Write a protein that binds this ligand. Structure first.
Ligand SMILES: Nc1ncnc2c1ncn2[C@@H]1O[C@H](COP(=O)(O)OP(=O)(O)OP(=O)(O)O)[C@@H](O)[C@H]1O
Ligand SMILES: Nc1ncnc2c1ncn2[C@@H]1O[C@H](COP(=O)(O)OP(=O)(O)OP(=O)(O)O)[C@@H](O)[C@H]1O
Ligand SMILES: Nc1ncnc2c1ncn2[C@@H]1O[C@H](COP(=O)(O)OP(=O)(O)OP(=O)(O)O)[C@@H](O)[C@H]1O
Ligand SMILES: Nc1ncnc2c1ncn2[C@@H]1O[C@H](COP(=O)(O)OP(=O)(O)OP(=O)(O)O)[C@@H](O)[C@H]1O
Ligand SMILES: Nc1ncnc2c1ncn2[C@@H]1O[C@H](COP(=O)(O)OP(=O)(O)OP(=O)(O)O)[C@@H](O)[C@H]1O
Ligand SMILES: [Mg+2]
Ligand SMILES: [Mg+2]
Ligand SMILES: [Mg+2]
Ligand SMILES: [Mg+2]
Ligand SMILES: [Mg+2]
Ligand SMILES: [Mg+2]
Ligand SMILES: [Mg+2]
Ligand SMILES: [Mg+2]
Ligand SMILES: [Mg+2]
Ligand SMILES: [Mg+2]
Lengths: 309, 309, 309, 309, 309
């Protein structure tokens, strides 16, 4: 059983980077639309008895990409692939992980059920919005972390990183920032709203680094950055694993005081970089490629939680 | 068939680093000396049907270490190991690779024959003194290169690396330096002796980096560094993959003008670092571990010739 | 046990010269081709209990000549010759002596293995491309040197030889030229490429003598000669032990500034001399004959490294 | 371990047919000549841990093709292929399988030794001239038979095949023809020379089918066909597994009385078909492909001795 | 072909004694260490067509001496010596001649393989620990016996030798002592441990002579001597062919009751004699010289099993 990497249409550059790191060519697949806009998928090579990995992120036209992924999984499964793995760098509907006093769907659970019923045997993803989403599955889920790559970027790009403060934009992400603060041996601050925000932790004359899983409309991080500059910070960075940047995010970032907005490439960023000078991209294709290769060879994946490959 | 890593007594720190990078514990082996100083080897665990890797460098008490390696290979082979690989970071007797108008042995060929007859199926080594030594074997030999790690060190440690000159100490190593000069887009200079040395290539007001496979007595690199300072160089570095440092090497380096003497850890360096402040060590255990893991899994090893893992 | 000299079809003039110097007639052998172009060999006399020497150079139709040599060795060995020696003035595939970051064969090692398995007990050759090729064998290899004959030619043909400069075309051959420069007590210069070439050593108003093991396409020596004339040299000679002269070599030499291109007769040269006026031939049949006679009589062969017989 | 099929330059059409029947693409390899006509081989993809099959027949420029095959085997073996198999449809030097009161080489044994020393683990060939050549190896040799394909051709092309006579051109091939005569339930005749030939077996008013392993100069089969027409045969066919057709074979066949000269495609035939109308080709690529696939999967190869796949 | 005797650095006095008995001078060889402690060997005279004997015992720095011997053998073999013989008075790793329910090497077999692959044609040794080691070779091995010299010493040094008892220290050596007891016409006793030892055979008022192949730490012979004095012996001698005397052997012998500890000079003894008064040395250089001369002249070597020359 050999590795076969297939790309959905969502993030083809990431799939190519992963394939190069694995020393493989992308599997032959046609993924287009019929005239009535139904997804058309044709696997152009035999996957019989192979270990198939389908790379598709929850970005762009999310429902189209999700249906493409489900259809590709189904096609590979009924084509007698030995194992089918969904590599989903940004998990769609992850923020709908609970009801919370509302007659709302748990869309993340529905997506997990659909992936299971399509025939996925395994899920590889990066920085799930809530790690409880792992429990939405009955198949194994490897939730990778961008934190090693983030730490690497911080050390090689922020000269004052030993005196910086890692800041959570809200009370929800504090855990994450504390982890980073522990790995860098720096202070960590929290910010939460009472339209006013309150900040705990000295940030004067120090570089502040907001850290988060995602930036969708960037209202949260822009408000946090305004507060950090109010409290005497020297420069404010924002580091996010998922740069969705929908709606007014680009305009707000352009009008914000960030020195840089670093995001990983779990979502393609070329279009946003055109209209926003201060967006920078961390490659995480090495982490994804190593996770694929370790799941295939039966090596430890959790080794990657703390080690940059 | 699983990976089993065994350490000879020559370089136990390197073996441990490799084992950690592989996520494995070192195999149980007793390697001591009988009273009459014959090597005693006892494999403390079953290696039947396993892929065995024995790590032993040509350093320290070279003949003792070589005999230890041969005895361990023999013990694993008659213990029904599926495959036995010798991981020899610094190949012993590599400099005796030819006769050249002398009634001399070709000791490198003798060592290759002894390794083959002991039962080695495969050799992993780093920067063979002459790559023709690969032809001394009939079994496959993977000759790894420290060059990716050297390039990484140069970029992250020499601030002026874009304006530096890579210098060969002699005409023999020019190929190597040209390779490095190609990967950095810098000038390359040669130095050869006519007790006088002649240098080709502008080095004034520029950082010079001597590059070589090994430093035994360091007469070559010390003379080259003196010449480089004569020709107006600003600082002179020396980068070698094998830091043997025998005889008067430490005193000469201490009396030399080197800013630093960077060597890889194919040979243990802790004792030399005690008596020489300007020696610095590049870890190459990641390259060796990746080579072991790729030979085991049937992935491409030559991928490592240009990529730091 | 008497000497029997057999000629392959590659270089019959050299075999005849060697046989005359030994006071012997060439052994009766038929070496032709079957209709389907397979080599046909028939030993026309008994070689039982004899010391057999088969002369065949790696020239012309190289694979045909090599197969002829292997077949003749096999025929003599199963005909109960006491000892079989391959006299190979120019060793085929000598330039494929290593892999060097390529998925390439080590063809020189393969040729050595084939010669050993055909039944060769001993190899006599001249100026191996790399002396490490000696280690590719387990049988003894005598690598003779054309240097004594070259020194003789230089003294008797270049009137200004005491003020000449011996020049290496590249960094690889410097050793050789230094040896010659030591035996003549003259200056030695190096030339290496950075499409531009750099020359170290005064050559103005002095005769320059490029020295090398072989000239295949003569791009190297022609570029070196152009550079030497640029640097004010009076006349430029080229002396090579192996005159392969394949491809465009004859046209380039005809368009080059060489006063003469001296080569030994390890490879037949009559055809090339027809189309190139400035090619001159040094006879080395005396060295080969003396080496054969000394190996037969158990006298010192290395005596020939410095003495013209 | 996957199948990798590599083509030598001798018979690229056959290699492509085999690759298509296996559902594979031919492995990336460069096989050209250096300027001095030495074979140049570069394996363009990793073969590490793979089951490598190199297809090269003993045809055309036989010594060049044989050296190409040996060099490719060596390149794959030192590139750490798990297993290397030589697929040699027509075995070179097969007719030099003995000495027989001559001081001649046993060239077939030399070729076997060279293949073994190059690193071949297994040989697949078709209709060895003498099956004793199998004993020239110590590695397994699968000698396939064209007889099933020949029987198929006879039944579907000769309408009178139930009343035909299978004829041996000489006493040596009688076994073969008897085998065929047994599988068709027809008469079998022998022909041997006393310049006159004597024929045993009624052939009047019956179609005669000469059968043989090879046709080199076609003197044997042309003389046999003349004798068969003398003895009242209606039509004479010739069926050979190896159509070498060297020397005057094409002219003799054109002047002969054969209805057809059927040969297998162990040797490329397109050029000969241009100048000879009555040559016809049986495809045996299915037999070779099935043999490769069965050796790879550990299924029975001898199943193919009697079954067309 | 003449005799050439070369000395390794292990036992130069023995080599000189052998050379004098042969009427020869020791061959010119340089055997030193490079700076990094690799063995350096240079044969200072032509050995072409000669019968070369290299004398090196398994004593002192055993792995260094063994590597020296292998390198010297290789140098002589590629220097076209007609025959190379290793004269190894004490065979290294002889006690590691089996595994015996342990995952241990058979180091003696490895040493034999290394000697064969270095190019040894013949082995001369004295009192192999187990004569089965002869079967570890495919080349002839002459295992000489010190017994004639021991018998001579006993008769000329022990006045009561006709009434003495020859004693084995263990059950393993009984054969040897019985041989001696047969040649002297005396009683023979055995001793074996049950920390207690049991002795069979009357030894009261009689001189006892322990006999053995080697004394390494001398625990065995010291315990045996204590038991012999317990059983009423008058004086106790110990005679060993190999006096290794490593570890605490000298102190134990000094504290033991031995009248004398006689050893042969297969291992140099001058240093041990300085610190131990009761060590005495039998010269066996006459046996070794006669064995060399008889192998050279084709005379019977086994003649020496019973005759002092
Ligand atoms: N794609 C989406 N874009 C924007 N809002 C979304 C999206 N999907 C779900 N939501 C809504 O966003 C809210 C979830 O917000 P969020 O994850 O920031 O906070 P939380 O889950 O309440 O707390 P926390 O993550 O801090 O523990 C819900 O009201 C949910 O319906
Ligand atoms: N361990 C050793 N320490 C020192 N010198 C050694 C050692 N082993 C061999 N030598 C000697 O060193 C010489 C080889 O030197 P070196 O490798 O620097 O140059 P080279 O092979 O002549 O040329 P180059 O490597 O530049 O092509 C030989 O004379 C060899 O005998
Ligand atoms: N017959 C041949 N003709 C031309 N090129 C060849 C031939 N055989 C091998 N080569 C190629 O030529 C190259 C070897 O070149 P060359 O011997 O001039 O330099 P090198 O070995 O890199 O260095 P140097 O000899 O200076 O130490 C390799 O790429 C090899 O594949
Ligand atoms: N390529 C070749 N082309 C032509 N003749 C060859 C070739 N190779 C060898 N020969 C010669 O052909 C003869 C072998 O002929 P052939 O195989 O037809 O008959 P055989 O071996 O004597 O008997 P049979 O095969 O009938 O049992 C030998 O003299 C051999 O030297
Ligand atoms: N150089 C050495 N010094 C000490 N012990 C050694 C040495 N080499 C091997 N040994 C160990 O010594 C043991 C062999 O002991 P010894 O030869 O005295 O007895 P044996 O082979 O069991 O029996 P015996 O020789 O009486 O038939 C083994 O355990 C072996 O590993
Ligand atoms: Mg939430
Ligand atoms: Mg949040
Ligand atoms: Mg060297
Ligand atoms: Mg050097
Ligand atoms: Mg070269
Ligand atoms: Mg060159
Ligand atoms: Mg025949
Ligand atoms: Mg026939
Ligand atoms: Mg024992
Ligand atoms: Mg004992």
């Amino acid at each position: 059983p050999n590795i076969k990497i297939f790309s959905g249409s969502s993030h083809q550059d990431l799939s190519q980077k992963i394939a190069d790191r694995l020393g493989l060519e992308l599997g032959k697949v046609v993924t287009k639309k019929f005239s009535n806009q139904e997804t058309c998928v044709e696997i152009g090579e035999s996957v019989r008895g192979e270990d198939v990995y389908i790379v598709q992120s929850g970005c762009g036209e999310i429902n189209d990409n999700l249906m493409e992924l489900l259809i590709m999984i189904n096609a590979c499964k009924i084509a007698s692939a030995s194992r089918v793995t969904a590599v989903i760098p940004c998990f769609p509907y992850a923020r709908q992980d609970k009801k919370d006093k509302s007659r709302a769907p748990i869309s993340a659970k529905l997506v997990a059920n659909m992936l299971s019923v399509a025939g996925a045997d395994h899920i590889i993803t990066m920085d799930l919005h809530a790690s409880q989403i792992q429990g939405f599955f009955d198949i194994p889920v490897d939730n990778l972390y961008a934190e090693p790559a983030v730490l690497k970027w911080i050390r090689e790009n922020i000269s004052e990183w030993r005196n910086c403060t890692i800041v959570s934009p809200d009370a929800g992400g504090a855990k994450r920032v504390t982890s980073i603060a522990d790995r860098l041996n720096v202070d960590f601050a929290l910010i939460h709203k009472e339209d006013r925000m309150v900040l705990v932790g000295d940030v004067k004359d120090r570089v502040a680094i907001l850290v988060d899983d995602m930036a969708d409309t960037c209202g949260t991080i822009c408000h946090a950055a305004d507060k950090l500059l109010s409290a005497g910070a020297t420069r404010v960075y924002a580091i996010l694993t998922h740069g969705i940047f929908s709606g007014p995010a680009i305009s707000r970032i352009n009008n914000a005081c960030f020195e840089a907005v670093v995001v990983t490439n779990t979502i393609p960023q070329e279009d946003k970089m055109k209209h926003c000078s201060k967006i920078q991209v961390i490659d995480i294709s090495m982490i994804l490629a190593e996770a694929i290769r370790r799941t295939h060879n039966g090596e430890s994946v959790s080794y990657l939680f703390s080690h940059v490959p």
